[PDB]
Amino acid sequence: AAASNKDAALLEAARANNMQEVSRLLSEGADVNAKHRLGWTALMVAAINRNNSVVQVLLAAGADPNLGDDFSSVYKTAKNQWTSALEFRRWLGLPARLNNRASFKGCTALHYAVLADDYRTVKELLDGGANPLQRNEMGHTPLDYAREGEVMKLLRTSEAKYQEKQRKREAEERRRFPLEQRLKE
C-alpha cells in the first residue's frame, strides 16, 4: 500500500499548496501522474491553485503536461450540445439555450492555467512541452479560453511553434525537390 499511499499524499499536498511535501513525496517515488478521485493530477490542481512554483517542481520530476482530467460529470448551464468556450468561461464565473452542456473531462493543466489567466504557469507548461493544440472533451483548446492580453499573445506564438516542431518531426526524407515539382501533386 506504500506506493498507493504516496500517490494519494502527493495529490493532497499539491491541492494544499504544500511545496515541501510535494518535493518530498516525488523524491520517495510518488507517481507524478497520479489522479485524484476528483479527476485531476497534481499538475492540474497546481494550475487551478495558480501555483507556478509547484508546477515547475512537478514538470522537473517528469510530470506529463498533456494528461487530461478524468472528471466526467456533465452539467446543464441553463434551463444537447457542448457550451461554447465563451459561455464556459461565464459558467465558471470568469470575466467574459441549445448548447448548454459543460464538462471538465480532458482539461489539461494548460486549459486550467489559461482559464486562470496565469501567464507564469502557462509559460512553464508550454516550456515543459504542453501541447497548446490539444482539445478537451468539449472540443476546446487552451487558446479558446484565453482573455485578450499576454496569455493570449503567448499562446498564439506557441501554437505556431508547436505546429512548426510537429511538421519538422514528421518531415519526409527527400534528396532533391526541383522547383518544377511545386507545380505537380
Residue numbers in the entry: 129 to 207, 228 to 244, 257 to 345
Task: Reproduce text from the manuscript describing this model.
SKD3, also known as CLPB, is a ring-forming, ATP-fueled protein disaggregase essential for preserving mitochondrial integrity and structure. Ankyrin repeats are one of the most abundant motifs found in eukaryotic proteins and the Ank domain is the defining feature that distinguishes mammalian SKD3 from microbial Hsp100 unfoldases. Here, we present the atomic structures of the isolated Ank domains of SKD3 isoform-1 (ANKiso1) and SKD3 isoform-2 (ANKiso2). The two isoforms differ by a 30 amino acid stretch present in isoform-1 (exon-5), which represses the protein disaggregating activity of SKD3.
